[PDB]
Amino acid sequence: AFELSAAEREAIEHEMHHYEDPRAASIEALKIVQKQRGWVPDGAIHAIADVLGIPASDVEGVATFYSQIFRQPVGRHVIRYCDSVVCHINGYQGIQAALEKKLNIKPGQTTFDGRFTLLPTCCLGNCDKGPNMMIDEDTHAHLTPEAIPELLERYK
Amino acid sequence: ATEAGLLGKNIMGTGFDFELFVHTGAGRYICGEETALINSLEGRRANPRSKPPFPATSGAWGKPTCVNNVETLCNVPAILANGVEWYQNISKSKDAGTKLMGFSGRVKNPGLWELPFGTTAREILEDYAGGMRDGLKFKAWQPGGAGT
Amino acid sequence: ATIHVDGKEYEVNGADNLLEACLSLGLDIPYFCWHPALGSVGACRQCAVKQYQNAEDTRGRLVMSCMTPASDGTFISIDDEEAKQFRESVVEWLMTNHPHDCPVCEEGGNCHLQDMTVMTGHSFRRYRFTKRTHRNQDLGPFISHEMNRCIACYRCVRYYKDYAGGTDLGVYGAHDNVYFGRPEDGTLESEFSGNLVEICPTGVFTDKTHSERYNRKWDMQFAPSICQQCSIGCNISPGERYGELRRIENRYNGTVNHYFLCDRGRFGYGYVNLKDRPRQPVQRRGDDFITLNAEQAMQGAADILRQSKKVIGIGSPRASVESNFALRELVGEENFYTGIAHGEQERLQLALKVLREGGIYTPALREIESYDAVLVLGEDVTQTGARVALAVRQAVKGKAREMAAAQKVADWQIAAILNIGQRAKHPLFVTNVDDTRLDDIAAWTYRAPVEDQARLGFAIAHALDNSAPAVDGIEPELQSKIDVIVQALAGAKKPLIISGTNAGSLEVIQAAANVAKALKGRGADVGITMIARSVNSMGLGIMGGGSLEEALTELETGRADAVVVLENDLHRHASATRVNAALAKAPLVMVVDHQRTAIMENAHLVLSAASFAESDGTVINNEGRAQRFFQVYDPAYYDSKTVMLESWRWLHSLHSTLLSREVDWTQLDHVIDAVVAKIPELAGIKDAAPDATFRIRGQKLAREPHRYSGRTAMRANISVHEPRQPQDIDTMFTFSMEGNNQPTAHRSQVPFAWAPGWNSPQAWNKFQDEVGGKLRFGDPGVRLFETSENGLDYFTSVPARFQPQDGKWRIAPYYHLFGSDELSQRAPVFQSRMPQPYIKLNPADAAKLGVNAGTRVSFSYDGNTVTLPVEIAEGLTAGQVGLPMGMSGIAPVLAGAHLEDLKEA
Ligand code: SF4
Ligand code: SF4
Ligand code: SF4
Ligand code: FES
Ligand code: FES
Ligand SMILES: [Ca+2]
Missing domain, CATH: 3.40.50.11540 (NADH-ubiquinone oxidoreductase 51kDa subunit)
Known part of the structure; x- marks a missing residue:
């Protein structure tokens, strides 16, 4: 039981205006659906395939290829902590341990109330200010393990 | 624009x-x-x-x-x-122009500075990055990111 | 071009890459992701060889032979130490996550991955960590899915999307979690999805129909045969075990059906293994059903045939050339009737006259992939001649091929070809009563009744050449579409026109012939292709005879007191009530058939004939190529009471007992020579295959591999004394492994492909002069007729515009690849694939009748008030009812007929 809303439909059509191939708007269509609903459900693949004209297999392959197109349900806020080499030097392990102590979950799962979903991510391009962490649209730098509990309370 | x-x-x-x-x-x-x-x-x-x-x-x-x-x-x-x-005529090196260089990772002042080609990596580490932090020694370095 | 492999000089074709050039020369390079039909992508990185630019060079560079052109002056090494270690490492990396599944794998012994693991010489495992696993999807009744065995070689998706045009298979996932399949569970609805079991080098996609009764490849007894499920005549390799037809493998014919079959011809073979088939001659005495052997059946049948005043014979397009000829020579020239109806025979003879008298060259199926602009008139090709639709897809992608070839891009760089030719493609114009499966690549689709499709064809012929008869009453929008078609066809270099007898109209074939004549008159390399209905429709049309209605009225008026029906159910070409009354009125009905048809209740004598898996014969396909199919197994080897013989043998021995009161079992070459002696138009069937005296250096051709097992134990439950192997006096093959199956043997009939080190279907590489090209020493089967020096004249009988008459409903045929064949629908595996019987209706006509989608309405045809549920068809024109041809109770002869009393009940 899935159906694209109006605003998603004109957003996808306006992004199809940008390219000479309707296939080229698939990533942005998936991102629009993900922005509206938090993630991309099963019927969204076929609905985007219908609105673009491409087969649903290609839409599923694009949705499962990219890590930031979530094909499983996530929480209200997506915590994304960098685990790359410079933040490993700067000690991302303490930040991850503090997040595990606070949220009481493993990386990849969602809390029972659906508030936070914890995810490792690649380099955020802020290695001079490491360690970094990307909450939904906000990047946080110069992290310390004691700043995690004071920093997780601004996302209700 | x-x-x-x-x-x-x-x-x-x-x-x-x-x-x-x-x-x-x-x-x-x-x-x-x-x-x-x-x-x-x-x-x-x-x-x-x-x-x-x-x-x-x-x-x-x-x-x-x-x-x-x-x-x-x-x-x-x-x-x-x-x-x-x-x-x-920016630098007397075979690579013309200026490159955004800089050291990161447990240094005193990690950052990004525009330097001409031919500047040695030691000048970036001590004059710009400030060297290693307090009580830390230097072991290795990677010039161009994770794939070097 | 000249290359140097390991210091040896070789002359290769410079337009090929190094992998196919070296595989053509017999050099073994391991490979996974490359296929001769699909192209080169450089994925598996298995084909590494060390390249040198000079004759004096020591270091070299490891390159991919599939991605490296075979230019002049390249010095490559295959068995260099670095290249061998890298190929062994690639095999080892593929072996890190591969499951310990070879005993419980259907691809074991037929596995390309096994062959390439053995060829690189990797047999020691140093990987000690875990192996990744995958869940499996349900892909329908035909294809079994086992995702753990995948090596991520991308052959399946490349074939299924870039070749077959399918839309529900793809790559999903990530870094090493690549998944290959469907986004959900469901049946693969591509009509060519069955080729995945041979495209996939591993056991991911397997034949579920073969997996039900599974045996290994060495245990299979193979034969070269021709698929009998439609008129295209694809070469197949049926393989049996323990007296039952186990699998249908693809048999390479570089002229017809090179690497790919269709799903109907690959999974529709289950009628051979039915237990209701006749296995003895059965004679009816009142209510008793007594069983005779061959001699008493011949003596009794000849006695009643001599005690009758006239004997007539009703053949079938399902029978071979020899069996129909034996019936004709048993009953006489004037007493022989073709089993098809009058309209079907008229369309068939018109198509044959166009093919062998129209002066336009009819292409082979491989040659269809080279034509520029394709116009399909009336034919639903993907449901009747599906392999022609696959070749049409290839011809459509020919535009992207030529556009990339204009930019100095190699032929085998398939990814670059698809990149340059993004969506530009060759023009395709299909006409049908509804939407087709070629509409995703068709430049235009015309949904109209067959009269309007014929009128559009005549308008195209008139606009191309003004000497063609004109049709008046065409709308200006239709005129614009017609002149678009005319500008596309006139600007083409090799136009192709495809029609057939399945449209149910004569004027469609006339319009296609006129379009082809107009294209030929402008000086164009036009080809024409007629799609017939059954496997040997063209042979029955060439041999000819009366229609089924003439035989029915001969039986009804009483002039014929003896009717011999050869492999015909007679309800497919005529109404069941009239046929039942005619056969009940006749005092002797003698039916030679291998499937339990409905007219056997009225049959006074039933002769248990042999199917294609148990008989030898010749079949003429839709392009006029005579092809010989050979017997796979002897039915009486396991089951000793089975008396099942070739139909031509039945009828020849019956005629001998009729004439000289002696039973004479003939030979296949004798019947072949009789056909060449009596019918000069069937003279080419002698050269279709060599006779039974043909030998390869004194020995015969083996039907089974040299490691065929269980010889002293497969019959030990019946008797511990192993009998002699059955003797094949008809053909040059033997029912044993004591024979020849070399890749370098001077023959054209290859039962199966096996080479040392090549157990997969990649073993066909050794049996070709060049890989992906022709078969070595020529392809089997010859053409019956050549292109005539002169052509026909313009057909001036332009039909009128279809006006929907009130009360009467025109029957629009809806053919299905699973369901519209007579014998394929009897397979038990097709029951889960055949669509439910739905009558298709316009929204306007259903709104007028008050019917919505789903409910059942009843219609009466010839006193049969049958009720079908309604499916709403938007593309169907008003005034027509869409009916599925070939289903239960709906004959293909119903196409184009009327339908009275269509009421909701
Ligand atoms: S796909 Fe081949 S290698 Fe893999 S388990 Fe099956 S037979 Fe063995
Ligand atoms: S499923 Fe088979 S054909 Fe597809 S990538 Fe895997 S091994 Fe290759
Ligand atoms: S296209 Fe026709 S002849 Fe070929 S495999 Fe299919 S049913 Fe058989
Ligand atoms: S390494 Fe973490 S932000 Fe770049
Ligand atoms: S065959 Fe060349 S990389 Fe796969
Ligand atoms: Ca035989």
Whole structure:
């Protein structure tokens, strides 16, 4: 039981205006659906395939290829902590341990109330200010393990 | 730039039409490869392509396509404004121009500085990055990121 | 071009890459992701060889032979130490996550991955960590899915999307979690999905129909045969075990059906293994059903045939050439009737006259992939001649191929070809009563009744050449579409026109012939292709005879007191009530058939004939190529009471007992020579295959591999004394492994492909002069007729515009690849694939009748008030009812007929 809303439909059509191939708007269509609903459900693949004209297999392959197109349900806020080499030097392990102590979950799962979903991510391009962490649209730098509990309370 | 006569139709009275778009990615490292970038721009999975053919002859949607870094396109207006001979006379090195260099990782002042080519890595570490932090010794370094 | 492999000089073709050039020369390079039909992508990285640019070079560079052109002056090494270690490492990396599944794998012994693991010489495992696993999907009744065995070689998706045009198979996942399949569970609805079991080098996609009764490849007894499920005549390799037809493998014919079959011809073979088939001659005495052997059946049948005043014979397009000829020579020239109806025979003879008298060359199926602009008139090709639709897809992608070839891009660089030719493709114009499966690549689709399709064809012929008869009354929008078609066809270099007898109209074939004549008159390399209905429709048309209605009225008026029906159910070409009354009125009905048809209740004598898996014969396909199919197994080897013989043998021995009161079992070459002696138009069937005296250096051709097992134990439950192997006096093959199956043997009939080190279907590489090209020493089967020096004249009988008459409903045929064949629908595996019987209706006509989608309405045809549920068809024109041809109770002869009393009940 899935159906694209109006605003998603004109957003996808306006992004199809940008390219000479309707296939080229698939990533942005998936991102629009993900922005509206938090993630991309099963019927969204076929609905985007219908609105673009491409087969649903290609839409599923694009949705499962990219890590930031979530094909499983996530929480209200997506915590994304960098685990790359410079933040490993700067000690991302303490930040991850503090997040595990606070949220009481493993990386990849969602809390029972659906508030936070914890995810490792690649380099955020802020290695001079490491360690970094990307909450939904906000990047946080110069992290310390004691700043995690004071920093997780601004996302209700 | 579009409202102030710099992008769109008939730019600066010449008669040249150019439209600029921003395509926000979906978070995959392999998308930075130029042929995988072209594949991702076409709405496909970002598998790279074999070369030849190069993207200059058949790139995005089978058309001639040139893929360039941000810093190259940021170097080009200085070349077109201050001249070419000025650009060749920035440093006495075989690599013309200035590169954004810098040290990161447990140093005193990690950052990013514009330096000419030929500056040694020690000058970046002590004069700009300040050297290692308090009570820390130097063991190794990587010049160009994670893939070096 | 000249290359140097390991210091040896070789002359290769410079337009090929190094992998196919070296595989053509007999050099073994391991490979996974490359296929001769699909192209080169450089994925598996298995084909590494060390390249040198000079004759004096020590270091070299490891390159991919599939991605490296075979230019002049390249010095490559295959068995260099670095290249061998890299190929062994690639095999080892593929072996890190591969499951310990070879005993419980259907691809074991037929596995390309096994062959390439053995060829690289990797047999020691140093990987000690875990192996990744995958869940499996349900892909329908035909294809079994086992995702753990995948090596991520991308052959399946490349074939299924870039070749077959399918839309529900793809790559999903990530770094090393790549998944290959469907986004959900469901049946693969591509009509060519069955080729995945041979495209996939591993056991991911397997034949579920073969997996039900599974045996290994060495245990299979193979034969070269021709698929009998439609008129295209694809070469197949049926393989049996323990007296039952186990699998249908693809048999390479570089002229017809090179690497790919269709799903009907690959999974529709289950009628052979039915237990209701007749296995003895059965004679009816009142209510008793007594069983005779061959001699008493011949003596009794000849006695009643001599005690009758006239004997007539009703053949079938399902029978071979020899069996129909034996019936004709048993009953006489004037007493022989073709089993098809009058309209079907008229369409068939018109198509044959166009093919062998129209002066336009009819292409082979491989040659269809080279034509520029394709116009399909009336034919639903993907449901009747599906392999022609696959070749049409290839011809459509020919535009992207030529556009990439204009930019100095190699032929085998398939990814670059698809990149340059993004969506530009060759023009395709299909006409049908509804939407087709070629509409995703068709430049235009015309949904109209067959009269309007014929009128559009005549308008195209008139606009191409003004000497063609004109049709008046065409709308200006239709005129614009017609002139678009005319500008596309006139600008083409090799136009192709495809029609057939399945459209149910004569004027469609006339319009296609006129379009082809107009294209030929402008000086164009036009080809024409007629799609017949059954496997040997063209042979029955060439041999000819009366229609089924003439035989029915001969039986009804009483002039014929003896009717011999050869492999015909007679309800497919005529109404069941009239046929039942005619056969009940006749005092002797003698039916030679291998499937339990409905007319056997009225049959006074039933002769248990042999199917294609148990008989030898010749079949003429839709392009006029005579092809010989050979017997796979002897039915009486296991089951000793089985008396099942070739139909031509039945009828020849019956005629001998009729004439000289002696039973004479003939030979296949004798019947072949009789056909060449009596019918000069069937003279080419002698050269279709060599006779039974043909030997390869004195020995015969083996039907089974040299490692065929269980010889002293497969019959030990019946008796511990192993009998002699059955003797094949008809053909040059033997029912044993004591024979020849070399890749370098001077023959054209290959039962199966096996080479030392090549157990997969990749073993066909050794049996070709060049890989992906022709078969070595020529392809089997010859053409019956050549292109005539002069052509026909313009057909001036332009039909009128279809006006929907009130009360009467025109029957629009809806053919299905699973369901519209007579014998394929009897397979038990097709029951889960055949669509439910739905009558298709316009929204306007259903709104007028008050019917919505789902409910049942009843219609009466020839006193049969049958009720079908309604499916709403938007593309169907008003005034027509869409009916599925070939289903239960709906004959293909119903196409184009009327339908009275269509009411909701
Ligand atoms: S796919 Fe081949 S190698 Fe893999 S388990 Fe099956 S037979 Fe063995
Ligand atoms: S499923 Fe088979 S054909 Fe497809 S990538 Fe895997 S091994 Fe290759
Ligand atoms: S296209 Fe016809 S002859 Fe070929 S495999 Fe299919 S049913 Fe058989
Ligand atoms: S390494 Fe973490 S932000 Fe770059
Ligand atoms: S066959 Fe060349 S890389 Fe696969
Ligand atoms: Ca025989």
